[PDB]
Amino acid sequence: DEQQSQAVAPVYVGGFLARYDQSPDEAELLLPRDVVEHWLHAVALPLNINHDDTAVVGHVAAMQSVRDGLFCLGCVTSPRFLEIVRRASEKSELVSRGPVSPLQPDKVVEFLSGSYAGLSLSSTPFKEVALCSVGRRRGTLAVYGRDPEWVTQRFPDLTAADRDGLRAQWQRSTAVDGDPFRSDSYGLLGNSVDALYIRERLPKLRYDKQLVGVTERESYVKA
Amino acid sequence: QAVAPVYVGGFLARYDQSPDEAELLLPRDVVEHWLHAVALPLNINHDDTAVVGHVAAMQSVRDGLFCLGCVTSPRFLEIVRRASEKSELVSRGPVSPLQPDKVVEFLSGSYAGLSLSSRRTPFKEVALCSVGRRRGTLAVYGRDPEWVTQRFPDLTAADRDGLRAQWQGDPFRSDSYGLLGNSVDALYIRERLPKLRYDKQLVGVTERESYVKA
């Protein structure tokens, strides 16, 4: 209970929604810097599971256009979603194996890291942000952690100035969040089988990890 | 209807396949000895709190050990039913002729392999798993046990008669959460799809005439 209480504390997620250096084969995935800045530069977008309106699990706490792409920081807050994740994490051998040495085991964070390893922006233009098994845009690796600062520190490309801009954002009471989640374990279970048949899933995830340099520092990423 | 029984068939071992593991070896003779040549429980990934049914028949044939299982647990079937309604893969349906069967399709996609762990004393249990450690252990699901057996070209009428003679309280103590945890594990099994496709080719089953998803 006490230890289970920590499991369902909020979970932050960060990562690029798009990499300006990545040229996609599909026109639909194009998202140039000028386009992003226009709508972005010159209010809190919901965060969900695979773009499902009934699976809102939190909100976006910061969005920043940087040198290498569009970076996002979200916050998973749904008590229902986190409890579901807590229970499944207890029956995962992947999770039982734990994280890389120095990191403290964190079943909930590890389960999220394993299942929803990608970030997905889709559509105002900026409608919402989705956690998915793997993103269609390359470099969209999802990085989970209990601390916003820690998550941002997982990406070598971000400079101290970049992080300052992001911080000003998350430090600022959202409309999306009682519990915005309107799905269940059965729903998540149905989605898990879909993930099993995504082709090149692991190679895509490993490619993303190297592209954003998360391979350089320790994290809960399972890929 | 959807939660009616589901049969699953497939080889638990291919005598022609050389187990890249000395512990997975399973010679014909040792098999036929324990065989005819208490029905074994059928569970999920060898979790004994996840028994979904029983083995209805086993037959040692030319190419290996063929098995036919029956998924009967109502608790399990109902859990599967709900999840199947929230699966895009399942919503896409099967290939042309075959009629949609959500529960059968979710099972085909999630537990595409069979696993025997006679580890020990003889045959202990058969597990439905995302992919088996032994090659050629593709799991084929269906509502009619006859149809399922007809999915494997290797089997002969004589082989089928032997199996036919055999197949002719809720034991599940798990939940949606347990299956979900197992689902993330499956995502990290290496070469899952390549192995499944290999198994599929080996036993001659096609997505074009079954519910197999790999």
Q: Are B130 and B199 in contact (CB under 8 A)?
A: no
Residue B111 to residue B179: CA distance in whole angstroms: 11
Question: What angle (nearest 5°) sits at the alpha carbon of residue B175, between those of residues B44 and A100?
Answer: 75
| Resolution reading in Å | 2.0
Q: What is the largest CA-CA distance in chain B?
A: 45
Q: Rounded CA gap, B55 and B51, in Å?
A: 11
- Chain A residues near residue B183 by CB distance under 8 angstroms: 88, 115, 189, 192-193, 195-196
CATH code of the domain made up of B1-214: 3.20.16.10
CB A109 within 8 Å of CB B199: no
What's the distance, CA B70 to chain centroid? 9
Question: Chain B contacts of A90, Cβ < 8 Å?
Answer: 177, 181
Which tokens hold the place of B129? 């798993």
Q: Where are the domains of chain B?
A: 1-214
Tell me the residues of B at the A interface, defined by beta carbons under 8 Å apart: 79, 82-90, 106, 109-110, 130, 175-188, 190, 192-193, 213-214
What is the DSSP code string of B16-38?
TS--SSTTS---HHHHHHHS---
Method: X-ray
Residues of chain B in contact with residue A194, where contact means CB-CB under 8 angstroms, are: 87-89
Between the CA atoms of A194, A220, A73 and A76, what dihedral angle is there, to the nearest 10 degrees?
60
Give A147→chain B minimum CA distance, Å.
24
Q: Does domain A1-223 have CATH number 3.20.16.10?
A: yes
Chain B hits for A222, Cβ within 8 Å: 188
